[PDB]
Design a protein around this ligand. Structure first.
Ligand SMILES: *[C@H]1O[C@H](CO[C@H]2O[C@@H](C)[C@@H](O)[C@@H](O)[C@@H]2O)[C@@H](O[C@@H]2O[C@H](CO)[C@@H](O[C@@H]3O[C@H](CO)[C@@H](O)[C@H](O[C@H]4O[C@H](CO)[C@@H](O)[C@H](O)[C@@H]4O)[C@@H]3O)[C@H](O)[C@H]2NC(C)=O)[C@H](O)[C@H]1NC(C)=O
Ligand SMILES: *[C@@H]1O[C@H](CO)[C@@H](O[C@@H]2O[C@H](CO)[C@@H](O[C@@H]3O[C@H](CO)[C@@H](O)[C@H](O)[C@@H]3O)[C@H](O)[C@H]2NC(C)=O)[C@H](O)[C@H]1NC(C)=O
Ligand SMILES: *[C@@H]1O[C@H](CO)[C@@H](O[C@@H]2O[C@H](CO)[C@@H](O[C@@H]3O[C@H](CO)[C@@H](O)[C@H](O)[C@@H]3O)[C@H](O)[C@H]2NC(C)=O)[C@H](O)[C@H]1NC(C)=O
Ligand SMILES: *[C@H]1O[C@H](CO[C@H]2O[C@@H](C)[C@@H](O)[C@@H](O)[C@@H]2O)[C@@H](O[C@@H]2O[C@H](CO)[C@@H](O)[C@H](O)[C@H]2NC(C)=O)[C@H](O)[C@H]1NC(C)=O
Ligand SMILES: *[C@@H]1O[C@H](CO)[C@@H](O[C@@H]2O[C@H](CO)[C@@H](O)[C@H](O)[C@H]2NC(C)=O)[C@H](O)[C@H]1NC(C)=O
Ligand SMILES: *[C@@H]1O[C@H](CO)[C@@H](O[C@@H]2O[C@H](CO)[C@@H](O)[C@H](O)[C@H]2NC(C)=O)[C@H](O)[C@H]1NC(C)=O
Ligand SMILES: *[C@@H]1O[C@H](CO)[C@@H](O)[C@H](O)[C@H]1NC(C)=O
Ligand SMILES: *[C@@H]1O[C@H](CO)[C@@H](O)[C@H](O)[C@H]1NC(C)=O
Ligand SMILES: *[C@@H]1O[C@H](CO)[C@@H](O)[C@H](O)[C@H]1NC(C)=O
Ligand SMILES: [Ca+2]
Ligand SMILES: [Ca+2]
Ligand SMILES: [Ca+2]
Ligand SMILES: [Ca+2]
Ligand SMILES: [Cl-]
Ligand SMILES: [Cl-]
Ligand SMILES: [Cl-]
Ligand SMILES: [Cl-]
Ligand SMILES: [Cu+2]
Ligand SMILES: [Cu+2]
Lengths: 708, 705
C-alpha cells in the first residue's frame, strides 16, 4: 500500500492592515511604489519589527504578556521641499492605532534620499531613457555590431553598485547584453557600458556621464557614433545566437535511469505549523527578513533553548575587471534584499522531492501583499554516513552505531545572475550548522586586451570577472542562560625531561586556556590565526565540573577584504573580521542596512562601531561570523557555477554542554553483541526494514508556481 | 523496481605455498611464532611499475608481471633481520627476489618488526601470570581482582622506548567491560614492559605507575600498600549509561529516511573496478597504508593514476606515562589489516553495494573481511547548480546533486577511521576522513586543566591530534605537469574617468612554481588560494588545463622538529607538497616507522630537494587533521559531525565547459511551458515512476574475529 507566534513574519492579513493604516495617516497624495517617481511619496516596504529581547523572553519563560506585534514601514518621502526616507513603526497588530518615526532615534537625523534603493519603476525610467533617447543616437554603430532594430529592444541592461564615487552620488554603470531567449543573458555582453546619472528628482534631467565601448572611453553616444561613421572604430562582431552551455541550459542528453530518491517509510518525523518546526529533538521558528534574508529564532534542543537568534545579516560581492562596470562593482546585497529576491524552490532539484514546502508573504514596492510560493523547504536527510560507529573485535565482540539524519531549512535568493543557497542544518548530536552556496550565473564582460589580471576567458569574446563572495551571520547564542563568557582553548608543546628516564627529552603536549575578557580580544581579522577551540560558555558547569559551552567552528577561505584606505570600506567593515563577539544590544540589531548599498561612503550602520572597549565576561553575547571565498571564474562555471567545494559557513557544537552525547539516547541507534542474532527483529530494528519499508513511496503530483 | 586488484585467495595461497617451498623447513606459522622463529608476517600485492602499467592501459602493451610482496621475520639466525621479498609471477610463482638492501641500503634491524599477536599474548602471560599476582592484595582491594582471574585487559601504546633499538611498551590496565568500550575504564595501573629480548623469559617490568605515582616494581607497590601508605581510589567496574554501554535505553520510533534506486543501481562493481556513466576506476586496500584508488577516468579521460592513504597519526598528551608518550603511527599496525565489516544501514546506506576483502596477515592461510568496502550513489539533497530567472526571460535550470562513494573503515584499538572517496558529477573528486569510535582515556588524578577534560567519573579524556597523509598522483591530461599559484591582490589607482578619485583595483596574481621547495607548504603557512597542477595544453579558451587542490584542514601543531622521533612522520609538518613521482618513492611512510621513528625506514622530507617540477610526472602529497580535546559529548563515542577533513580535486580550465551541462538528470523549463508535463520535466514523471516497493535484501552482518 501507500506509505503513511512572536517571531513569525507578518501574514497577508497583517500586511494588509498595516497598509490600510498607512494609506490613511500619510495623506492622500501617496503613490503606489510600483509606479512611483522620485518626486512621489510611496511606501517601499512593510515587514515585521522584531520584538525587544527582554519582553520576548519574559513571555516565553514566565508567560508575561507578549510585547506588541509591530511592523516597520520604510516610506520614501519625495513630494516635499526636503525629501527623505523614513522608518515608521506601526502597531499594534492585529489592529493598528499608532505610527512612530524612529529615523532620528536610530540615525541621529534624516535618512538622506540618495540612500534609498533604486525602485523597479526607476530602473524602468532608466531603460526608457537609454532605449528611447540614448541608443537611437548610436543607431548606426549598433546596427552594425549588435543586430539592432528601430523599436527592437533586443538589448537589456544590468545595474551595478554602488552608484558613484562619494556620498550623494547616484550614477550607475549599466552594461548592455543580448536579450537571450530562455537562458542567462549575463554571458553575452555586447561591450557597451553606460554611466547613467539618475540622481535628479526629475528623470528628464538624467544624463550619460560617460560611455565605454569595446575597450575605449567616449564622452557620449553621438561622439561614439561619429567616430564609428568616420571609420575609426574597429567593431568586433559579437554573435547574438548559438548552441551549447554558453547559450542554453537545456541538456541535449535524454534522461536515463532515475537518480536515487529519499523517502519517509513511516511518514515525516517533524511538523511545520505556521513558522514553527518541531521534531523529537528540535524546536525553532524560521522566517525571512526582507533585506537581510533567512533567520531562525528560539532554537530549543530537547526542550532547552540554545540560540535566541541565528540570522543572515548581509552578503557581499567585490569585483575586478577590464571595464568600468566590473572595475567598481561592490554589491551589498541587502540593498536589493535577500528576502525580496527569494525565489520559488523547484521540488526535487532545489530540495528533495519529499520536503515540506512553505510559502512566504511580503509587501514590497506595492500596495497589496504578495506571495512567493515554496520559498522555504524543511526536510530530514539521511546523510549516508554514520554519526558514531564502533566495531569491536578486541576482547568483546559487539557493534554500536547510528546513521546520521539531519533536519534542514533552506531558502534561495536569486539576485541578478547568482543564486545564493542558505542552509541551516540541525544535527542529532545537538550541533547546528550554517552553510551558504553561490550558484547560478557569473557576471562576465566583453573580452578585449591583455588577459591575466582580471579573470579567465570562459567563452567566445567573454571574460569571467574575478571577484570575492562574503556573507555575515548574527549568532546570538544564549548558552544555558543569557550570561556568557568566551573561552580560547588551543595546544602547545613543552620540552621537558622524561620523568622515568631524565637523560631523555620528550615534547609534552598541553592544552592552553585563555578567557577572552574584552571585545577586542574576541575580534579576529581575516588572515590571522584563531584559537583552535573558541567557545561561548555559561557560568554553570556540567556534571564533570566544566563550564557548559558551545564551540564556534569556522569553514571559510575568506577573500582578502577591501583595503581600509578605500573610502567605501566602512560600508561593509564586517568583511575585515572572520569572527567577532560583542555584547548583544537592542540598538545594534544588524551588522548592515538596506541603505548601505547606495551610500557606503556614509554608512547607515558601520559594524566596526560594535567593537569597543567593552567587557564580554558575563554578558548577553552575540557572535558575528563572516564566511567567504575568492572566485576566479573558469570554463566549468559555464553555464553555471557548481555548488561542490563552494559551501562555506560554520558549526555550532556542544563542548561540555551535556553530560554525555545526547545521541546515546537516539531512538534510531543500533547495537548488538557478537553472540546474538543481528538478523533478528528483537535485536536489530534495521532487520525489520525489509518488511517495514515494503510500501510504495507517497508522492504528490509535481507543481511549480512562480514567475513574477 | 585487472592490474590494481588486491591479491585474491588463490593468489595468496600460491605465494604462501611458494614461500614454504623456497624458504626452507625453518618456517613457522606467524600466528604462534616466538620472537626467534622464522615466519611470514604478511603477503600482499606489489603495485606494478607505472611506466608498464600505462603502456598496457594506453598503448595495448603486455600487462606487467603480477607480483606480491611478502614480509618475512628472520629470527632464527645469528643476525636477526626482517626482509621484504618480491615473489612472482602470478598465477604460478617462479622467483623470489630480496629487495630489502635495494630499497633501504642495508638490512632492516629486527627491533623494527611490528609486535606479533603472539608477542602480545606472551606479554599478557607475563603480566597476568608472573607480574600482577605480586600485587594481589592491592588489586583485590582496588580492582575486584581474583587469583588466576582476568577481569582486567591491557592496551598497548607506541612507540616503544626513547631511542633507536628499544622495545619497551607502556600498557595501561582496564576493566574487561562486556559488550562496550573498555577504554573508558582505566584502572590507574600502567606497566612499562621491556620485551626487546628474543627469549620472553628475559623480559622485565622497568617501571610501574599507579594512581598518579611511580614505583620501581609491583612488589614495592604491594609492600607499600600493605604498609598503609597507598591511598587507593576505588574505581567501580559496573554502571549504567553512556560510559558503560552503547545500547540506547530508548525504544525505536518512526523509521528514519531511506534512499532507494527507483530503476535499480546506476553503477556496476566488477572485481575491483567500478563504472558509472561518468566515472571509471579501481579500488583496493594496502595492508598497512590503507584505502587506495587507481586509474580514475572521467567520461573516459584519466584524471588521476593513484590516490591512496599513506599514514595516520595520533599524537597524545596526558597525566600518565602511557598518554604522555603515545605517538601512534597507524600503518605500523595497518589500516588495511584492521579494516572492519561495514554494518549495512548504519555504516553505509542500506542499499549500497558491499564488497569483501582478502588478506594474508600473520597466518598460514588467507582470510576474508566480509563487507570491507561499500560503493553507492547518494542524493545529496542539494543542487549541483541552479538558476531561477524572473528577469527579462522566465525559466528555471537546475540539477540535484548525486555523488558516487567508496567507503572503508578501520578500527585501530579505540578509534574508527572512516575513509571516504567521493566522485562528483562536475568532475571533482573529494577525499574525506572521519575519526569516530571511542576516545583513549586515563585515570584522573591531580591538576586537571592541561591534559584534557574529565568526561566521566575517574576519567580524563586525553588531549591529542589526528593527522592523515594522502598521495595524489594527478596526471592532468598527460604525465607532464606544471604547478600554478593563483591568488588576489588590490592595487590602488586613480579612477580612469574621474582621476581625482581612487579605487582599489582587484587583480589576480599568477606564479609558476618551478622547484619542489616552492610547492612545499608547512603547517600554519598561508597557501595560494588557487593552487593547481596543469597540463601544458590549453582548453578551447587558451588556458592551461588544470585540476586544483582545495584543502579543508584545521591541522594541529606538528610534533616539534627538535624531537628525535619527528623524522618518523615528517609529513606531519606539511599541508601540501608536490614532488616528482619516482618509482623508489612510492610511500611517504612505512610499516617499520612505528617501532623505530628515531631511525625512519621512510623519511618523507627526503622527497623534497632542489628538483624541478616544471613539466615532469608530479605527485601531490596532502596532509589533513585537527586537534581533539575530548569533552563530555565524546562519551560514549566521538561523533563525526564537522570532524571530517581532507580535500577536493576540482577541474580548473580542464574542460571547455561544465560537464554537468550534458547531464542526463538535469532539468529545464520556461514560464510558457508546462512545468508539470512529463515530456518537459522528467521530474513530474517521478511520482508515478517511483510507485514501486523497494527491494531490500535480508539483513546480514560481516562477523567478528
Ligand atoms: C556565576 O554567576 C552568577 C551570577 O552572575 C553575576 O554575579 C555577580 C556577583 C557579578 O559577578 C555579575 O557580573 C555576574 O554576571 C553567580 O550567582 C551570583 O553569585 C553572587 C555571589 O557573590 C550573588 O551575589 C551576592 O548576593 C548576596 C545576597 O544573596 C549579597 O549579600 C552579596 O552582595 C554583597 O557583596 C557585594 C560585593 O561587591 C556588595 O557590593 C554588596 O553591598 C553586598 O554586601 C552578593 O553580591 C548573586 O546574587 C548570584 N546571582 C544569581 C542570579 O544567582 C553564580 O554563583 C556563578 N556560578 C558559578 C558556578 O560560578
Ligand atoms: C522626513 O519627512 C517626514 C514626512 O514629511 C517628516 O515628518 C513630518 O513632519 C511634518 C511637520 O513636522 C508633519 O506634518 C504636520 O505638521 C503640522 C504643521 O505644524 C502639524 O500641526 C501636524 O500635527 C503634523 O505633524 C508630519 O506628520 C510628519 N510626517 C510623519 C507622518 O511622520 C520628517 O520630519 C522628515 N524627517 C526629518 C528628520 O526631518
Ligand atoms: C636477512 O636474512 C635473510 C635470511 O637469513 C638473508 O638472506 C639469506 O642470505 C643467504 C646468504 O647467506 C642466502 O643463502 C644462499 O641461498 C642459496 C639458495 O638458493 C644457496 O645456494 C647459497 O649457497 C646461499 O646459502 C639465503 O638464500 C638468503 N635468504 C633469502 C631467501 O633471501 C639476508 O641476507 C638478510 N639480510 C641482509 C641484507 O643481511
Ligand atoms: C607543451 O609541451 C609539449 C612537450 O614539451 C616538451 O618540450 C621540451 C622542450 C621540454 O620543455 C619538456 O619538458 C617538454 O615536455 C610540447 O610538445 C613538444 O614540443 C614539440 C612539439 O611542438 C616537439 O619537440 C615534441 O612533439 C614535444 N616533445 C615531447 C617530449 O613530447 C608542446 O608543444 C607544448 N605545448 C604548448 C602549448 O606549450
Ligand atoms: C526579451 O525577450 C524575451 C523572450 O526571451 C521576452 O519575453 C516574452 O515577453 C512577452 C511580453 O512581455 C511575454 O508575454 C512572454 O511570455 C515572454 N516570454 C518568456 C519566455 O518569458 C521579453 O519581452 C524581452 N524583454 C525585454 C526587456 O525586451
Ligand atoms: C572479556 O570479557 C568478555 C565478555 O564477557 C569475554 O568474551 C567472551 O568469552 C567467551 C568464552 O571465551 C566467548 O565464548 C564469548 O564469545 C565472549 N563474549 C563476547 C561478548 O564476545 C572474554 O573472554 C574476556 N576476555 C578476557 C578474559 O580478557
Ligand atoms: C537561434 O538559433 C537557432 C538555431 O539553433 C534558431 O533556430 C533560432 O531561431 C534562433 N533564435 C532566434 C529566434 O533568432
Ligand atoms: C579599556 O578600559 C579601561 C578603563 O576602565 C582603560 O584602562 C583602558 O584604557 C581601555 N583600553 C583600551 C584598549 O582602550
Ligand atoms: C551491571 O549492572 C547492571 C545493573 O545496574 C546489571 O543489570 C548488569 O548486568 C551489570 N553488567 C555486568 C555485565 O556485570
Ligand atoms: Ca560593543
Ligand atoms: Ca547571547
Ligand atoms: Ca602525475
Ligand atoms: Ca624530489
Ligand atoms: Cl537626492
Ligand atoms: Cl616526544
Ligand atoms: Cl632485536
Ligand atoms: Cl574601491
Ligand atoms: Cu562567484
Ligand atoms: Cu580524537
Amino acid at each position: 500500500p501507500h506509505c503513511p507566534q512572536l517571531f513569525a513574519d507578518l501574514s497577508r492579513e497583517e500586511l494588509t492592515a498595516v497598509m490600510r493604516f498607512l494609506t490613511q495617516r500619510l495623506g492622500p497624495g501617496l503613490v503606489d511604489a510600483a509606479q512611483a517617481r522620485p518626486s512621489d511619496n510611496c511606501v517601499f516596504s512593510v515587514e515585521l519589527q522584531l520584538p525587544p529581547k527582554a519582553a520576548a523572553l519574559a513571555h516565553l519563560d514566565r508567560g508575561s504578556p507578549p510585547p506588541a506585534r509591530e511592523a516597520l514601514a520604510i516610506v520614501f518621502f519625495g513630494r516635499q521641499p526636503q525629501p527623505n526616507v523614513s522608518e515608521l513603526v506601526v502597531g499594534p497588530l492585529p489592529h493598528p492605532s499608532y505610527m512612530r518615526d524612529v529615523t532620528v532615534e536610530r540615525h541621529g537625523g534624516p535618512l538622506p534620499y540618495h540612500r534609498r534603493p533604486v525602485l523597479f519603476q526607476e530602473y524602468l525610467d532608466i531603460d526608457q531613457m537609454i532605449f528611447n533617447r540614448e541608443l537611437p543616437q548610436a543607431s548606426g554603430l549598433l546596427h552594425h555590431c549588435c543586430f539592432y532594430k528601430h523599436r527592437g529592444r533586443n538589448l537589456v541592461t544590468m545595474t551595478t553598485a554602488p552608484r558613484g564615487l562619494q556620498s550623494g552620488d547616484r550614477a550607475t554603470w549599466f552594461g548592455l547584453y543580448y536579450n537571450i531567449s530562455g537562458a542567462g543573458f549575463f554571458l553575452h555582453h555586447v561591450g557597451l557600458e553606460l554611466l547613467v546619472n539618475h540622481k535628479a528628482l526629475d528623470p528628464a534631467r538624467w544624463t550619460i556621464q560617460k560611455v565605454f565601448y569595446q575597450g575605449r572611453y567616449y564622452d557620449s553616444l553621438a561622439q561614439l557614433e561619429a567616430q564609428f561613421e568616420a571609420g575609426l572604430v574597429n567593431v568586433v562582431l559579437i554573435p547574438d545566437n548559438g548552441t551549447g552551455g554558453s547559450w542554453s541550459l537545456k541538456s541535449p542528453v535524454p534522461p536515463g535511469p532515475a537518480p536515487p530518491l529519499q523517502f519517509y517509510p513511516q511518514g515525516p518525523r517533524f511538523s511545520v505549523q505556521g513558522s514553527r518546526v518541531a521534531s523529537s529533538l528540535w524546536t525553532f521558528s524560521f522566517g525571512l527578513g526582507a533585506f537581510s534574508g533567512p533567520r531562525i529564532f528560539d532554537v530549543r534542543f530537547q526542550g532547552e533553548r540554545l540560540v535566541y537568534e541565528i540570522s543572515l545579516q548581509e552578503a557581499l560581492a567585490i569585483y575586478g575587471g577590464n571595464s568600468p562596470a566590473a572595475m567598481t562593482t561592490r554589491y551589498v546585497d541587502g540593498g536589493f534584499g535577500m528576502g525580496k529576491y527569494t525565489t520559488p524552490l523547484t521540488r526535487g532539484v532545489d530540495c528533495p522531492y519529499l520536503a515540506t514546502y512553505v510559502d512566504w508573504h511580503f509587501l514590497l514596492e506595492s500596495q497589496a501583499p504578495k506571495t512567493i510560493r515554496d520559498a522555504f523547504c524543511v526536510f530530514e536527510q539521511n546523510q549516508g554516513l554514520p554519526l558514531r560507529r564502533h566495531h569491536s573485535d578486541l576482547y568483546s565482540h559487539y557493534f554500536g552505531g547510528l546513521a546520521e539524519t539531519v533536519l534542514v531549512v533552506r531558502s534561495m535568493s536569486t539576485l541578478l545572475n547568482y543564486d545564493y543557497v542558505w542552509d541551516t542544518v540541525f544535527h542529532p548530536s545537538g550541533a547546528i550548522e550554517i552553510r551558504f552556496y553561490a550558484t547560478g550565473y557569473i557576471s562576465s564582460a566583453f573580452l578585449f586586451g591583455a588577459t591575466g589580471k582580471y579573470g579567465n576567458q570562459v567563452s567566445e569574446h567573454t571574460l569571467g570577472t574575478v571577484h570575492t563572495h562574503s556573507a555575515h551571520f548574527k549568532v546570538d547564542l544564549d548558552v544555558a542562560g543569557l550570561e556568557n563568557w568566551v573561552w580560547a582553548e588551543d595546544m602547545v608543546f613543552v620540552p621537558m625531561a622524561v620523568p622515568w628516564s631524565p637523560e631523555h627529552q620528550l615534547q609534552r603536549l598541553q592544552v592552553t586556556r585563555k578567557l577572552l575578557e574584552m571585545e577586542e580580544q574576541a575580534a579576529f581579522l581575516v588572515g590571522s590565526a584563531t584559537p583552535r577551540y573558541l567557545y561561548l560558555a555559561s557560568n554553570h558547569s556540567n556534571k564533570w565540573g566544566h563550564p557548559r559551552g558551545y564551540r564556534i567552528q569556522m569553514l571559510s577561505f575568506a577573500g582578502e577584504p577591501l583595503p581600509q584606505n578605500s573610502s567605501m570600506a566602512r560600508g561593509f567593515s564586517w568583511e575585515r573580521y572572520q569572527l567577532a563577539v560583542t555584547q548583544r544590544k537592542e540598538e545594534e540589531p544588524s551588522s548592515s542596512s538596506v541603505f548601505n548599498q547606495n551610500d557606503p561612503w556614509a554608512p547607515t550602520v558601520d559594524f566596526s562601531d560594535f567593537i569597543n572597549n567593552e567587557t564580554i565576561a558575563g554578558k548577553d553575547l552575540v557572535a558575528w561570523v563572516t564566511a567567504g571565498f575568492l572566485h576566479i571564474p573558469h570554463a566549468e562555471d559555464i553555464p553555471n557555477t557548481v555548488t561542490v567545494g563552494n559551501g562555506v559557513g560554520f558549526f555550532l557544537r556542544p563542548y561540555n554542554f551535556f553530560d554525555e552525547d545526547p545521541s546515546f539516547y537516539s531512538a534510531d541507534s543500533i547495537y548488538f553483541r557478537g553472540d546474538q542474532d543481528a538478523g533478528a527483529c528483537e535485536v536489530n530494528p534495521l532487520a525489520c526494514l525489509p518488511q517495514a519499508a515494503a510500501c510504495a513511496p507517497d508522492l504528490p503530483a509535481f507543481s511549480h508556481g512562480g514567475f513574477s
